[PDB]
Every structure is written in C-alpha cells, then in structure tokens.
Amino acid sequence: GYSDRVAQLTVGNSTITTQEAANIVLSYGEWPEYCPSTDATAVDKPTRPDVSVNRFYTLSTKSWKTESTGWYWKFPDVLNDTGVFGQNAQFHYLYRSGFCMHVQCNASKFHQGALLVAAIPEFVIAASSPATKPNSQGLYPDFAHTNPGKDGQEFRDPYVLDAGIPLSQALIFPHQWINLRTNNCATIIMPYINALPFDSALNHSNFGLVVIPISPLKYCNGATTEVPITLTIAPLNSEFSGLRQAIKQ
Amino acid sequence: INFTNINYYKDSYAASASRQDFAQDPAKFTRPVLDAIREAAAPLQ
Amino acid sequence: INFTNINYYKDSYAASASRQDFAQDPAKFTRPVLDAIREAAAPLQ
Amino acid sequence: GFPTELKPGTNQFLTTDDGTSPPILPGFEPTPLIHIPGEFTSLLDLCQVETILEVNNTTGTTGVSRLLIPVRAQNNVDQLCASFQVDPGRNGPWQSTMVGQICRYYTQWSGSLKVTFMFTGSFMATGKMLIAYTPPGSAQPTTREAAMLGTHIVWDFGLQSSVTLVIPWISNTHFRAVKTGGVYDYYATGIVTIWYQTNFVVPPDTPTEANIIALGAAQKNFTLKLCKDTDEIQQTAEYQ
Amino acid sequence: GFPTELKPGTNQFLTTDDGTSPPILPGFEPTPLIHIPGEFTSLLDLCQVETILEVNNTTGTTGVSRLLIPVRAQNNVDQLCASFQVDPGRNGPWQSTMVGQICRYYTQWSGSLKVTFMFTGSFMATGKMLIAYTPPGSAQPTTREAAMLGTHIVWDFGLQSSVTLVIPWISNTHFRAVKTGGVYDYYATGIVTIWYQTNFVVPPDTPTEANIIALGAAQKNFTLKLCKDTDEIQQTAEYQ
Amino acid sequence: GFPTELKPGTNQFLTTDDGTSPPILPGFEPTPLIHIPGEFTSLLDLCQVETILEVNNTTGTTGVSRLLIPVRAQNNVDQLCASFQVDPGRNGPWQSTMVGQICRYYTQWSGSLKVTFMFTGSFMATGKMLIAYTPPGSAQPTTREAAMLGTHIVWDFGLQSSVTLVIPWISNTHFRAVKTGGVYDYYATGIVTIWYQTNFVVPPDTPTEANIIALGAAQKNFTLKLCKDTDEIQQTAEYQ
Amino acid sequence: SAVSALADTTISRVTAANTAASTHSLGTGRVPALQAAETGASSNSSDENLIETRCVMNRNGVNEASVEHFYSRAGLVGVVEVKDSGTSLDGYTVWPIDVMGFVQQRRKLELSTYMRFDAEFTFVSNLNNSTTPGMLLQYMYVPPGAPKPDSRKSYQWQTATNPSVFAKLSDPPPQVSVPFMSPATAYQWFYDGYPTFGEHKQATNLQYGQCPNNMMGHFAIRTVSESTTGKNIHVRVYMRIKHVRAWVPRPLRSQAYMVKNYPTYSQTITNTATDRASITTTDYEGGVPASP
Amino acid sequence: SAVSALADTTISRVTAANTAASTHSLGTGRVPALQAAETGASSNSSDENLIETRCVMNRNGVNEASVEHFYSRAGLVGVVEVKDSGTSLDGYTVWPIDVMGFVQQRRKLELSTYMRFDAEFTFVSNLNNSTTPGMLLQYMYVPPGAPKPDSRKSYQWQTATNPSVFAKLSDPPPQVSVPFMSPATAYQWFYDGYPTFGEHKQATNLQYGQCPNNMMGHFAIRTVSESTTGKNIHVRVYMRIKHVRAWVPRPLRSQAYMVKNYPTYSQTITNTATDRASITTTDYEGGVPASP
Amino acid sequence: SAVSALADTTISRVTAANTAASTHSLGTGRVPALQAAETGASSNSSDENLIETRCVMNRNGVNEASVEHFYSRAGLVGVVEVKDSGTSLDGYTVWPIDVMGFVQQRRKLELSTYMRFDAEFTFVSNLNNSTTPGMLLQYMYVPPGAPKPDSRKSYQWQTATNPSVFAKLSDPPPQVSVPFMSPATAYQWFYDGYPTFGEHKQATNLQYGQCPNNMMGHFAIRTVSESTTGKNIHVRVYMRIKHVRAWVPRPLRSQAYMVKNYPTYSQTITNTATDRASITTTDYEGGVPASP
Numbered sequence A: 001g002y003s004d005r006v007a008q009l010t011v012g013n014s015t016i017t018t019q020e021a022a023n024i025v026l027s028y029g030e031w032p033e034y035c036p037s038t039d040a041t042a043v044d045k046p047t048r049p050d051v052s053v054n055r056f057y058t059l060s061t062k063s064w065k066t067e068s069t070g071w072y073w074k075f076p077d078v079l080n081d082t083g084v085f086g087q088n089a090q091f092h093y094l095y096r097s098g099f100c101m102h103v104q105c106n107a108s109k110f111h112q113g114a115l116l117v118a119a120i121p122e123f124v125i126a127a128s129s130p131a132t133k134p135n136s137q138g139l140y141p142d143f144a145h146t147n148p149g150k151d152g153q154e155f156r157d158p159y160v161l162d163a164g165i166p167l168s169q170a171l172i173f174p175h176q177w178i179n180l181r182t183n184n185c186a187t188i189i190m191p192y193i194n195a196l197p198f199d200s201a202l203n204h205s206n207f208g209l210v211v212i213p214i215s216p217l218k219y220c221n222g223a224t225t226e227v228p229i230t231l232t233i234a235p236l237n238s239e240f241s242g243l244r245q246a247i248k249q
Numbered sequence B, C: 001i002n003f004t005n006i007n008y009y010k011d012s013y014a015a016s017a018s019r020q021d022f023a024q025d026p027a028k029f030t031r032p033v034l035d036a037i038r039e040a041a042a043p044l045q
Numbered sequence D, E, F: 001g002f003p004t005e006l007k008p009g010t011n012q013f014l015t016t017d018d019g020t021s022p023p024i025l026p027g028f029e030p031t032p033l034i035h036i037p038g039e040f041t042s043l044l045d046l047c048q049v050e051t052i053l054e055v056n057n058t059t060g061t062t063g064v065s066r067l068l069i070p071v072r073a074q075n076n077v078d079q080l081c082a083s084f085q086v087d088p089g090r091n092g093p094w095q096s097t098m099v100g101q102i103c104r105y106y107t108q109w110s111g112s113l114k115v116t117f118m119f120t121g122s123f124m125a126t127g128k129m130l131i132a133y134t135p136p137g138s139a140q141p142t143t144r145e146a147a148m149l150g151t152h153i154v155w156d157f158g159l160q161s162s163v164t165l166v167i168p169w170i171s172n173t174h175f176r177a178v179k180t181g182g183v184y185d186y187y188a189t190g191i192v193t194i195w196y197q198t199n200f201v202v203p204p205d206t207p208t209e210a211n212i213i214a215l216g217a218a219q220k221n222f223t224l225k226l227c228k229d230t231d232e233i234q235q236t237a238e239y240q
Numbered sequence G, H, I: 001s002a003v004s005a006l007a008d009t010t011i012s013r014v015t016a017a018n019t020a021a022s023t024h025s026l027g028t029g030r031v032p033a034l035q036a037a038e039t040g041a042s043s044n045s046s047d048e049n050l051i052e053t054r055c056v057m058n059r060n061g062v063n064e065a066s067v068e069h070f071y072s073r074a075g076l077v078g079v080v081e082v083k084d085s086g087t088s089l090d091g092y093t094v095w096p097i098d099v100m101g102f103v104q105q106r107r108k109l110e111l112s113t114y115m116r117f118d119a120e121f122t123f124v125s126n127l128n129n130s131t132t133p134g135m136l137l138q139y140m141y142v143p144p145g146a147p148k149p150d151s152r153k154s155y156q157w158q159t160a161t162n163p164s165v166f167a168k169l170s171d172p173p174p175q176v177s178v179p180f181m182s183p184a185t186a187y188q189w190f191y192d193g194y195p196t197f198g199e200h201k202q203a204t205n206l207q208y209g210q211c212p213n214n215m216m217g218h219f220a221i222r223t224v225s226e227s228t229t230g231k232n233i234h235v236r237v238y239m240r241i242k243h244v245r246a247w248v249p250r251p252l253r254s255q256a257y258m259v260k261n262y263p264t265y266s267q268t269i270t271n272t273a274t275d276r277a278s279i280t281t282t283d284y285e286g287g288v289p290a291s292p
C-alpha cells in the first residue's frame, strides 16, 4: 500500500534505474495507447517502429543554479531531430505517441531545493510585452521560445509559466516534485492528448515539459556547486502515417 | 408533473443542456499515480 | 378536467405555489403545556 | 387556433435559461467524438487538486518566492513561522489555488479544506512544527500556547516530507459566503498559523533556512453553490 | 407552428396568479431544511391563541394599563364594570388581539369567538360577575336585567382565576364582513358587557380595586375569507 | 387560453428551418408522379462520377485543350509531365469537376479522391508514367526520386487505356475545409505529379505528342459537410 | 398513467369545525367554563359546553387562511429608479436586495420569525409618464461577492455567470423564479444578535440585528445604451413568496416603521387600540327597545 | 409509455460526501497525516483520520459544480456595430466569429484545453439610445469559404445555403442552436503549434497558436435596406455553451489579457495573491480574548 | 400508440464507407488499377486495392449531402417593388412567378433537369429604409388564367377563389406552403423544345426553351389602400423547396448568366478553372525538405 523508492524503467534498449523515486505519475490515469479503429481517420497503415523509437532519449542537461528560473521543452519538438523517432517524425506527416518523461536531479543530503516537473498539454508560450500595437514584435514569442528544440528554453517568468497562468496552479497538470531531501527523479507517463487522432510532429507540440525550481537550490560552501538536471524522455506507442520526403521544419 | 427536456427539432443538438449526468471522477487529477498509496500508509517506504 | 400544477422547468422551485397541503395544528400554540387539561376539569386542582 | 395566454416573462432573454432553439444546420452530424485523456465533468474534482498557496504574499517578495514559507533555525522557542486565513475566496494566499479561483465563480462554499505542507530543506534538516487551525471568533493566536487549543497537527520532518492539515468544516451555517470582509466576516473560516514546535536543527555545513511549500485543496465533502462571475480579471476594451 | 389564439388577459401581471416562471439558477439546491420548532401552516391556528384585549382603551390610560379592566368594591348593586363590542376588525379593544389583526387581512370572518377573563386580584378578593354577550339588534344593555337576557356567564372568582365567555356565532349570514360602521353595522357582532353579579368583597387590609385581564381569541370553527390588505400601518416613504 | 410564454427566436425567419406552413390550396392533389429515369437522391452519388480535370489551365490554352495533359517523347529521363494540387475546392483543375463544384457548396469535405488518367495516344504509342500523390507538408517534388516516396502508381500504357490513382484520405483531421489558402493550407490535401517513368516511345510515322485526360471523382468514403453558398458565379443584377 | 395527478390538482375545500348539538348541564365537578390562563394555554372551552348549541354542519372553507395563500401574493418589495437624466446620467442602478422597504410586504413577513421560501420576482418598469417605449433593459442579479457594475458599459454586464434578464419596457413584466437563496435553513426577519464578534460599543450600533444570511446581493439594472437616454426608468419589483415555510409566529407590528433594517419606533407610541370615551361606552345604537 | 422519461426530467440532488464519526487513535505505523507531495498526488488524508469527527449526513448539493452548469450560461462573445451613419455608410458588417474577445467568457473557456460543445447563440441588437425600432436585420452565418458580403445589396445575402436569420429590432432576441462545428473532435483554446509548415522566422510571428480548427467563419449582419439608414445598430452576441465536454483542465488565467488570439501578458506581472504586510499578519480581529 | 412514430423523428446518422485493412499484392491477372474510361463507367478501383490501407470504421455523416438537405433552404427567388411614389403611383404590382431570376437559387436548381417539389414561400417585405410600419399588404396568387389586377381597387382583389395573404409589414414574414403545381410530373429547368408548333423562323426566337408547364402564374401584391401611400414596398420572396425529387443531374453552370429564361453566355467565355503559370507549377510551399 505504498510506493517503493526503487524503480527501473525498461523501454527498448534503454533502462533507467532510480533508487530515490517518489512514484510514477500516470497522466490522467490513462496509459499511452495506439489509435483505435474507431478514433482513427487516416486510412494509411501506420508504422509502429516499436523498439527503434520507443526508448529513452537522454536529451538535455541543465545546470541548476541558485537564481535559475526553470526550463521547458516541447515533447515532439525535443525529439524531432534525434534518433529513429526524429526520422519517422520527419518522413511522416502524421504522428501520435505518448511519452515517459524522466527528469533526473541528484544532490547530496546537504543540498536543498524543490523542482516542479509538470507536463502541460498544449503549452502555448506567451510573450511579455508592454501595451503595444498588434504590429509589435514583443507581443508574440519567437520560434526559439515556441519550439526550443532539444536544448529547451530557460523560463523568463516562471511565476506565470510564460503563459499568463499562475505557476501555483500548474499542479492541475500531471506533475511531480523533485524534493532533494526526498527524491532525485520525477517520472510522468503521458498519453497522447489531442483533439485529433494524429498530428504533425513538426507543427504541433502536444505537451510542454516544465522543470521549475520552486524552492531555490541552496547549499553550503564545500558542497558540489554543479547540480545538473537531466531530461530523459521515452516515446510510448509511437505511430507514424503519411510517408513522404523528409521535412525538417 | 414535469414536462421538459423535450426536443422540438429533428436535430439533436437543438435540445436543451444535458444536465442529468453529474459524474465526479477526481482520481485522474488527484491520484494520477501508478502505485496506489493507502491513506494510513507512509507513501515512500 | 384540470390541467395545472405542471412544472415546465427542470428546477423544482420554478413550480407554482404548494397549495394542496393545508394542515392545521394549533395545539403547539394554544395548548403548549405538559399536563393535558381536560375541558370539563378544573385546570389547577 | 389553440387558445393561449402569454404570461409575464414573455419575450425576455434570461442568460441562464436551458431551453430549445432552432438548429441553424439541418442534418448536421459533427466530427466524431474520439477519446481525449483528461476529461473533467465537475469543478469539484478540480478543487480537490492541491495547488500552491501563496503564503509569502508580502511586499518585496517577487515571483516564485511568494510560494515559499521560509523556515530557519530559531534562536528562541515557541515562535511563529507563518499565518494565513483559510477563507478560500478572500484576497490572499488562496488566490493562487485552483480551489480559491473556482470558489470565486461561486457565491457560497461548504466542506473541509486541506493544506499539505511540503518541507523542502536538506535531508539533514530536522524540525517539528505545530500547524494550528483556529476556528472563527478568535484572532490570530499570539502564542503557540493559544494556538494549540484549536485544530492542530504537530508535523515532524522526515522521510515523508509532507503533512496534511485538514481545515475541518467548522461553521454555524451549512455554507459560507465566498465574499469576505465587513459584515461578511460572519463567514470567516479561521486562521492557520505555523509554529515552531521544536527548532529547525541542522548539522554543520548545512543550510540553516529552508522553505515549506503549502498546497491548498478541497476535501471530498467540498461543495460550491450559486455560480457567479469572478472578480479576478477586469476588462476595459474588447480584446482585438 | 402550432395554431394558437391569444385571449384576453394576455400580457397582464396579476399579483395573485399562481403560475410558473423560469428559474434564475439552473441546478440550484438550497440549504437543507432542518427542523425548526414552532412552524405554523395556518393563520387560523394563530387566531385561536388568546391575546390581551385592550378593553381600557380610554383617554388618559397609557401603556399596559390599557389592558386592564378595573374591578373595585361597589357601593351600589347591579353595576356595569366594562363593555366592548365583539367585532374583531373594528377599531377598538380587538385591535390588540392576534385574531383582531389577522381578521384585518381578510374581508369576511366567521365562527365563534372567545374571551377568557383572568381576575388578577388578591386571593382574598371574592366576587361574582355577569359577563353577557348581547346579540345584534340591541344597543349596550342599560341594566344587568336587560343584559342577562342574552348569552351570559356568571363568573365566580376562586382558585380557577379565569372564565371563558364564548361569543357564539349568532349571525344571519354565514360570514360577517370585517369592515364595520355605516351600513356595515349589518355585520355587527354584538356587545359584551361585564356586570357586578355580586359585589367585589375583600377582607380588611386588602386592595379594594383589582384588574380583570380579557384574553380574546377565536374558537375552533373560526374562518377567514377574501384576503385583503390591512389598514393598520401606513407608509408615506420607502423605509431607508 | 392555454398559458404560453414566447421565447427568443420568436418571429424570426430562419432560412433553414424545416417547419410547417399553411397550404395555399385546400385539397390540392398534384399531377401523378410517373417514373422518370435518372433520379439522384444524394449529391455524393454525383461526386463519384468521374469528370475531366482541367489540368492544362495555363495561359494561352483555350477551350477543350485545357482538358488535356500533353505527353510527348522525351529527350531526357525522369522528367515531369504535369502536376496539380488535389484540393477539390481550390481554384484550379478541380473546378472543372463535378466533385470540385459540389464541394464548393459545402464547407468541409472528407474521404478519398480518385483521378482516372486516360491515355489518348496511338495504339503504337507506349510509355510508363509515375503518378505520385505527395501528402501534405511537402511542396511539389522536384525529382521523380522525391515523388516516388509518396503514394504513387506506375502506369503502363496498353490495351487498358486508363489508370486510377486513388488520393487516399491522408489527413490529420476527420474533415478538410473546402476553403484553401492562407492559414487554410492547414487543410492542404497534397500534390499529384505525373512523371515519365520511362519515355514515350513511338514507332516511325506515328505522332510523338499525345494527351492524357485526367478524370477526377470521389471515392465511396467521400463525405461533405456544412452546406454553404458557392463562390463560382456572381450576380450584379436580377436576370430579366 | 399520471392523469390521476392532473385530476387532483384543484384545491379541495377543508371546512371549519362543526358545532354539535348540546343540552343543559346541571351538576358539579364539570366546569368547562373555568380556566387557568396562567398556564399559558388558551381556553379549551367549546361553544357546546357553555350554551345550548344546535347541530351546524359547517361548510365554511378554511383553506384560504393557509400560510401559502396568505403569502403567495406579489407585493412591492423595491422601487429602483434607473436615473439617466439631469445630474444623474448613470443609465444604471445597483439596488441592494431587501424586502423590508415597504410596509405591506414587511408587516406580513414579520408575522413569522423564520421563513424559508422560493419567490417569483416580477419587474414592472416604465417611464415617469407611465409609458413603456421599447427600451432594452438588463436586470442582472449580482449575488454577494460578484462585482457590481460601475457604469452602463462595464464588463460585469457580460453576465457570463450572473443571472440576467433582457427585456424591453414594451414587453410584459419580466418574471423569474428565485430559489431559497440563503446560507441558513430559513430567512430571518428578526436576528437578535450581531454579525461579527467584538465590543459593539459604537455610538450608533448599526450592526445589531443585521444577519448576512438574509443579505442576498444586488439587482443591477441598466438601459442597454451607449450614451445617456435622457429618461429615468422606474423599476418596481414585486415578490410573490411561494413554497412557504414559516416558523415562530410573532405579534404583528403595531408601531409605524421608521427604518428598513431595524425595529425602531417613535417616542410617540401609538396605542394598538383606538381610544373611546369610557370603558363602558360602546357606539352601537341597535334598535328601539320594546320596553325600557 | 414514454411518460416515465418526462417524469425523471427534474434535476436530482447529488449530495456531498458524508463525514463518518471517528475516535482517537494512539498507535504506530498508521500515519494518515504524513504524505508525499512529490508523488504528484493530492493528499488522501480524510477529516476523520486527523480529528475526532462526528457523523454528518451531508445533504449539500454538489450538482451545480458540473461542467454543464458552469458553462451553460449565455455570456457576451461579440459586439458587432452595424455602422450606417457618418463616415461609415455601410449598413452591414462581417464579424470574425471568435469567442475570446471578452474576459468573462474567455477565462471560463480557458479553464479547459479542449471543449466540444453545441451552442445557443442569441443576438441582442438595438440602437445607441437602447431603443429597438422595427428595423429588419439579416444575421447570415458565413462559414469558412463562403463568399463574404461586400455591400448591403450584394448577392451573398440571398442565403440559398448559408444559415440566415431575419428579425426586426423590435422582436425578442433572435436565438439559434449552433452545432459542434469543427474539423477536430473538440475546440482548442490552446494550440501549441503553427497552422502551416515553414520556418516561422517572422519578426512578429502572428501564426503561433492559431488553429484553424477553431476559426468558424463570420457573422454577416446587415440592415435589410436600400440606402443608408443613418442609424448604427449594436448587435451583442451571447453564446450559451450546451452539451459540454471539457478536457485537460488548466490554471485559470491570472494576468490581464492583452490580445484576442494570443496569451500575452504585460511586463508588469500582477501577483496572483494580494500583498500583505508580513507572512505572520492576518487581518481578522475576532473577539476579545477571555484571558490573554 | 403512434408515440413510436414521434420517437423515430430525429435524423439518424448514415456513415460513410469504412476502409478495410489491405495487404500487399504480388501477382498477375489482378489489376484493380487498370480501368477503361471509354466504357463510360467511373473507376471501380478502391483504396484497399491500390495502397495498403488500415481499418477505418468511418463515422462521418453523409446525411447532409441528400437532395432534400441541399435544397430545403429558403433562397431569394423574387424581389417585387410595390411602387407607390413618384411617377409610379400604382400601389400594386403583378409579378411573374419565376425562380430563375437570382443566381444562387438558379444554379442549385439547374443541377437537375427535372424537379418535383413542394415549396414554402416566405415574403420578407419592408420599406426602403428597412423599416416595417404597420401597412396592410395583400399577396394574392394569380394562377395562369385568373384575371390580373389592373389597380389597387380592382375586383380581382376580392380573392374569392385565388389564394391571398393579408399581412402587415409589422407582422413576421408571411409564410405559406405551395404544392407541386404543374401540368407535368415535374418542373423542367431545361426544355429542349418549343411550346407551340410552327416554323420558329423569327429573328429573335424567344420561344425556344419556354415550357409553360413551369409558368405558374403571377404574385399580385398591393397595399390595401384607398389612395397613394407615397411609400415603395420591397417584397423579397424566399422559396424553400421541400419534398424534393430530382432527376437527370447536370453540370453546374460555369458561365455567368445573362438572361432569366435562356441559357445565354457571353462571347467572352470564362474558363471553368483559373489559369496558372505552367502545367507543372503548384503553389503549395510546404515545409523545408530535410535533404534536397
């Protein structure tokens, strides 16, 4: 009737071991599933390259600092140029997949801090601008902020999630904390959420992956200053339809 | 004697609001975890 | 042939007045005493 | 012609009238309904999700720092860490909560609340806190001795990093008005004060000031009533 | 379109029309109904409660003294103590009664009345009174010999301190109009006169003047009809 | 008079309201319904009829020549014969089709399309063509090597003079908006390019340039939605 | 089927108490006339036991004296002037919902201490000259806590959640059903207490008797207009109390009211009964006596 | 027959969770208070397991907090001025159908990511002086792709296929039922993507977040007139969302909106919670303590 | 009873054709792609037999593409000006009933050669300033042969047998059901012939294509007036075609119409398809190719 602190996540040829894990958040209680015949609309037979694309891709490592605001990734965009997933995402017009997001941040028992690892469906990034005409560039975020790639994007205003919504209510989304005294990893299994059965992996980013320090990383002199935060994600039940020439963006 | 929830048009979307199917399933937002944790139990043991 | 007391709305408080339950219980105001006193009897004996 | 008599309320447009209206599109079959994960059918299900209380809503405190209750090693005993009123719809820490924002779309609320405090210090940081809920009629307790007379929990920091303080539904009325202030302090819910039961003890070479994150939510018996319009965002011109 | 024809009375707002109207709050469940003691469902139940008749409604008499019928030791015999008309809605002693005020919310009344006289003298004060109800057609009896020809009770003061004089429903019509005066004396109920059957005898060192308290109410066969607006309080400006 | 309350939408004339109206002619029996051949009860049945695509909609090309895809003997290999977008309601070759004109009376379409190419050269003219459907996201393929990565058919000229290229319903949404251009290229269907798989080989004394006639239609799973008004013919004055 | 319910929908007549025939009683120990009013109980003496009565099969209907029939009558509860002319170019008015502003409704309600009821609110709006030109009004119910409008154009009139009625003056009176809206089990016309804790040592003491369980918000009325209309609209609010549950009957008010939310009578106390010349003088002349 | 269906049409009351009676607990291993918020799960601690509770048979109705009741309320979604006076002698206006132009409706919708619903659109049209003279209007729905009118006389008003409503200003507000019109399974108030492929390197980047699955065409309104009427008509569009299906709840918007189709907040970020003097200061005075 | 009929009155959804799952085919003699368009038959090639398809349980509703739903929409069929001002002080107008005067209705009808239908004719009448003052109009149907009125007072308005509708402009639009009135089994939008025998050698040849089976008389409209009203009334006639039976589908008209009763196109023939630069140029930019 409890959650075991040890966990092993084996997907494909990738395996993730954690010895200080809180639990595994199954987003909205729904495992990732393949598109049923009732919900499908595209007639082409989808490709399900099970083990070549459904596997853990360690994508980015961000150095947690005392004044760090946080980072966000867009799930399809963060894997669109990586591995056989990226190739299928480029060669195919349609794509659907869940994911198993695994954020890793280990620190000594003398460090402190708390990250909020949340998976935000349809994470539309806002721009912070003064009162200006709709002609103004500052009213709308550039592409580097909407699709940060694999490197992610440092939050400008994590208090409002760079979306005008309060960070305090970001816990309405499938979330997990990395409290350094408690756990060093946060696992979120997110099913494919979209008003469409399939969608373009290049145009549309289904989920945002926010890692925001709520309690700032504090430690004493002599502790290891560099405390990294690693994002390992794994597609789950990846389908691809609409084969054509490979399209980058 | 109630005489309501009557559709006068052949299109079903012309009907009144569907106000008779109150369902409350908060577990998908409140306990979205794989390991079900008992209340009396220490969660991380 | 009466066709009334019909609620046309899903909310029960939109109905007409409840005018069919005339009840008269004056004893709680007229004889609010512990010792029931017969009419023919001298009350304080 | 069937004899009819038009009654008052004829020709009125009540914005909350669940009635029929002619369909603009004869024979329109919409796009099929596919399964989308995360359907919510009740706003009470959303109110039970714990969201961060903005307890450090003080002048100077900016950004995510407003979500932290600072806890440090005390030089004296029986001291006050933080306090906040537990009126969900009152301008204050509960504004940052999903329950405190959905409450504002309703006039009256009812049911128990729940604040889960998460300690975000070092593993080596130990401490015991007394988190007391003071029912109405009393101001914020001036001493821990006065606060421990109300509904309280003595929280011990440890492997489990979070404690839940249920604010029980202690009310004279079945519902409390979401509006507060003035004569509406009749519907005051109370005050939650966090006291140092013991100190915040740390070994050497360990941070001496940590943070408690408060997570407010609604209990299973929570209920809202009389949907109204919130007073959270105002508009002076149509968004173009 | 179903053929209909609008009839007269269309668009009118009748203030006494028990009809339906659209609910402003969809799905509103009110606060639960808990048991409150003292529910009254009929105004006739209130009219049967005995309330003090203001029989001493005379010039100079102020305050609670207007509720007392003075009785004293008489130097002569067969004297008149007090008289009052038994028209419930007439400006007079019955205004101070619950029956006389609920009667004014109705146009026509019917049924027997009841005046319970309570003697509030010393235990040593003895006396016999003749309380006579004179049916309509006769003025106030000038002598006790004339009053004893009507419905009367000879009241003996004693351990039981109260007597009940039923004013029987002696009327030509099934109902009497609450309005009195002018041609509406057709609906006169009668006159109740209190006479000294014997004297008011007291021993030495005992008060020689006591008070009778009249308590008017309605009998079980009392009935009201044609709800109207009372003429008891007038308003010249909205109460701000 | 039966109590009724008029609701919003009273007295409005909705042009798409299937309601009753009084008959102008009592007891009118129309002319008997005799069998007429060629009754159509569904516009989808009309959309499945193959009609000539106007693929040669180029400047200078006039008349029936706009319905021909010229094919000739090539001096080089892997060359492009013709290309056209497969958006049925887009201004282009599909305007000349019954499916492309009935699509314009609807806002959203769905289902597979079908282009039957008929080779109208000499019996002695042989050739193989690669007709490729490029799903959205890609521009017109610049080489046959890039086009053969999509849905394609290698057509061999012979006794059967016609090939069918199904444009499969490869869409993210269940329906595509008939409107194209701008942000509505989100509903782009793709591009069909005709490539010379091999050459157009003829014996001596034989025409070296022939024509392919494209015949566009809708597959059995074709569906239209949200009837609207087409933008094909405009009127500035009532036709007198 | 349910046609049996529609058949028994007319009001059935409940008759008054029949009078039984009674004869003379000559004995001891049986004293139905002697009572003890000190016991707090009304007299149980019947007409049969004090006079020789006849058999009266009474058929007088007592059904009209019910609390429902006494209260289910639309009376004036509010007059809201939508001033849009002269010095007050507002075009809107936010009216505190209170049913104790007019004597006829107030005195009937104060017959009971607690009343739990639904209401049928009707709005009879017109100009000063009694005319009702087609002029679009918006009657928005602003529950306690909802933002009150501060102009005729303010965002609160979007009424995304607030109940609102749009009706022209030319339309028949807007009529809506209001539920029992109260945090308490019943409304409370008399609240012997204070809403808040404290010392209550103010010179005015305005908070005595003020129960917020009865304060049900505001009625915001506006002309749906873009500028001043130059016309003042008088909205008369009529409340018909239905589904009534009354508790703890009270003496009907005898003194003239002076304020809305407080029992407060003048120092010149008016007697409940009108004065007469003497305690032995009745002004009923009757007929000519046969033999004086 | 089907009279059983008409009987069970009133809304039944679903009550809140009852509180069970609980006693004291003195032992080890049973820690219903200790939680682990890192797990992403809300606390399963009940009131019975943290305090000694009583048996409360709760009868509070939770039925009003449903997504249907929260959304089935007509709010303002559009104000369309049919300018026909002064410099704008058009007599018609083609209005882009968007429900995100007004804060009250927009903030309620953005509580959810995806919403699939039918709507009841109501048109409350009047002049500037709130008056509604008999003036024939035509409210034509122009779906995406249908030709938009370019004058008050143009051929598009023939509405042979377009839905159109003819109603005078004097008529009660025109009200129609609109189905779920969208190529997607649900509307999408937040679209983290771009409608078209490409580089998206523009200085403005206007296409981010613009999902054409929500762009449902235009509402073309005209006075059915032959020349200028000299009167501007203000059409207020009210949408009542019925048959609601909401997915992926979101944080309610905290910053003031700046534009219609983009989340864009000011550089002056407003705190979700109002500032107080100190983290240990609460402004609740309560009563006088018995013994301080 | 007949309550079963009222239950099955809502439109049931007929779905599109499902796609079956298909695998690869490597053999001879099975050529589902090769067709012979010379046979006049459309291709019977299915998606399953040309590509590897999946199983798509299609739930797209094809019910809206029916001839009933395509035609049962009120479109403008006539604009009748009742001139009563200036040089035309007639107060009446006799309008030849023809549904081919306006492009939107005409092009939809000419999709079919023969149409047998009942109609719901609606009359939306108003003044030039779009206002609808209470003004009594008489819409009299004058069938072929009935005497046409020659004034506003003439005897034909007695309408002892002619169908006539009296309705003020202030009333909602008069709406009547017209049966299938035709000597033929169906109306005939294209009549390749002449109504009368003869030589047909006129220089104009006005009688070609004129089938009197479609000429259904006149609509005589008058103001019920005794003198000139000084106001011109514009009556817009809207026909909703119901109970439709269509035969012999035709190509939709591509050239702009020039006259009412004749197919007649300009010498400047407009191409059905818009011109592009080349037969190998498509204006779809797509995305950036991964490796060109």
Ligand SMILES: CCCCCCCCCCCCCCCCCC(=O)O
Binding pocket: E024, G097, G098, G099, G100, G119, G121, G139, G140, G141, G163, G164, G165, G176, G178, G181, G187, G188, G189, G214, G215, G216, G219, G261
């Ligand atoms: C759309 C307009 C709707 C109108 C809403 C009316 C709401 C009325 C509230 C119910 C009235 C009864 C409670 C009044 C109690 C106040 C009296 C008092 O104690 O001072």
Ligand SMILES: CCCCCCCCCCCCCCCCCC(=O)O
Binding pocket: D024, H097, H098, H099, H100, H119, H121, H139, H140, H141, H163, H164, H165, H176, H178, H181, H187, H188, H189, H214, H215, H216, H219, H261
């Ligand atoms: C005759 C007049 C009929 C009115 C037709 C109204 C059609 C309304 C469309 C449905 C509204 C909901 C979808 C709105 C989504 C747009 C918001 C956005 O994402 O910017």
Ligand SMILES: CCCCCCCCCCCCCCCCCC(=O)O
Binding pocket: F024, I097, I098, I099, I100, I119, I121, I139, I140, I141, I163, I164, I165, I176, I178, I181, I187, I188, I189, I214, I215, I216, I219, I261
């Ligand atoms: C009281 C007013 C009643 C209106 C009577 C309308 C009668 C309409 C006739 C039916 C319309 C369809 C037939 C039109 C055919 C004419 C077109 C043509 O071939 O030129």
Ligand SMILES: CCCCCCCCCCCCCC(=O)O
Binding pocket: B001, B002, B003, G002, G005, H003, H004, H006, H007, H008
């Ligand atoms: C026109 C007649 C419509 C009849 C509709 C059915 C109403 C049944 C009456 C009982 C109400 C249901 C709740 C109950 O059982 O008490």
Ligand SMILES: CCCCCCCCCCCCCC(=O)O
Binding pocket: C001, C002, C003, G003, G004, G006, G007, G008
């Ligand atoms: C539309 C039909 C409604 C029928 C309602 C039931 C009426 C029954 C008729 C008898 C009236 C009841 C009193 C009686 O039994 O005489």
